[PDB]
Amino acid sequence: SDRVAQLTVGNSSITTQEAANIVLAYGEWPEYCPDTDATAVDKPTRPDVSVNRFYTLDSKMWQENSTGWYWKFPDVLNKTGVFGQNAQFHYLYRSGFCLHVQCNASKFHQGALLVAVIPEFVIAGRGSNTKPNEAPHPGFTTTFPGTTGATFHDPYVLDSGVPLSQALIYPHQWINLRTNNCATVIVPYINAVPFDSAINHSNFGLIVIPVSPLKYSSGATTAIPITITIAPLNSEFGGLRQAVSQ
């Protein structure tokens, strides 16, 4: 009554037979914007079925010498389906998310994955340069990876100068290959403004990081796949105009 679970959203479902508990980021449920916090005059749209379902991204390979992966979540679903079309045509966006990460293994493998969100996860530029007009800055495909993700260079400092030991202050879970084969984190809309654009601003970002490496004996399956399925709960869009991609 605690390890088996099923999450149905829209027309999509997710079943799991071994898992940890469902985390709720900062104890708040994602709901629609009230009339007190709202500031835009035009009425928003609410599909509530076509945009609130489980979108699955591609699979990342789990090997022995991996470093980690990170995504920018309001930017990964800008090319997929009706959510992407609404986020391209509209100008303001507000929604919560629900992130499931599946990485199953046998009873002879071992390892550990830290899966956490960071609100306003800023990428740093590696390089010792104290002059502001010459220092190295990250590219557009490094800051906004998209539906294909991006790997780390230094997971010890989260590519931001911040130790990943203290990354447990964020909403997080552990994929330990002997306890659970998946992780789930529900996240509300965390921002200092009621509505914001879903094109040039990414609220948060997931990070799967190998803490304990993947080890096994000869004969076991080598390549361990990693899949992430996400769901934009309670989506709201505003400011309908011409479609822009970026």
């Binding site: 605690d2 390890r3 508990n21 985390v23 709720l24 104890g27 708040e28 909403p171 306890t179």
Partner: protein
């Protein structure tokens, strides 16, 4: 707490809730019981 100005930001200046950081889980886990069945 006396203020001498029309604006309240020129004035002079025990709530705790650790249960949203320590245990932000959906299904509540008990103390004496095992966490997972």
């Amino acid at each position: 707490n006396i203020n001498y100005y029309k604006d309240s930001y020129a004035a002079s200046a025990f709530t705790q809730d650790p249960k949203k950081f320590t245990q932000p889980v959906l299904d509540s886990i008990r103390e004496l019981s095992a966490p997972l069945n």
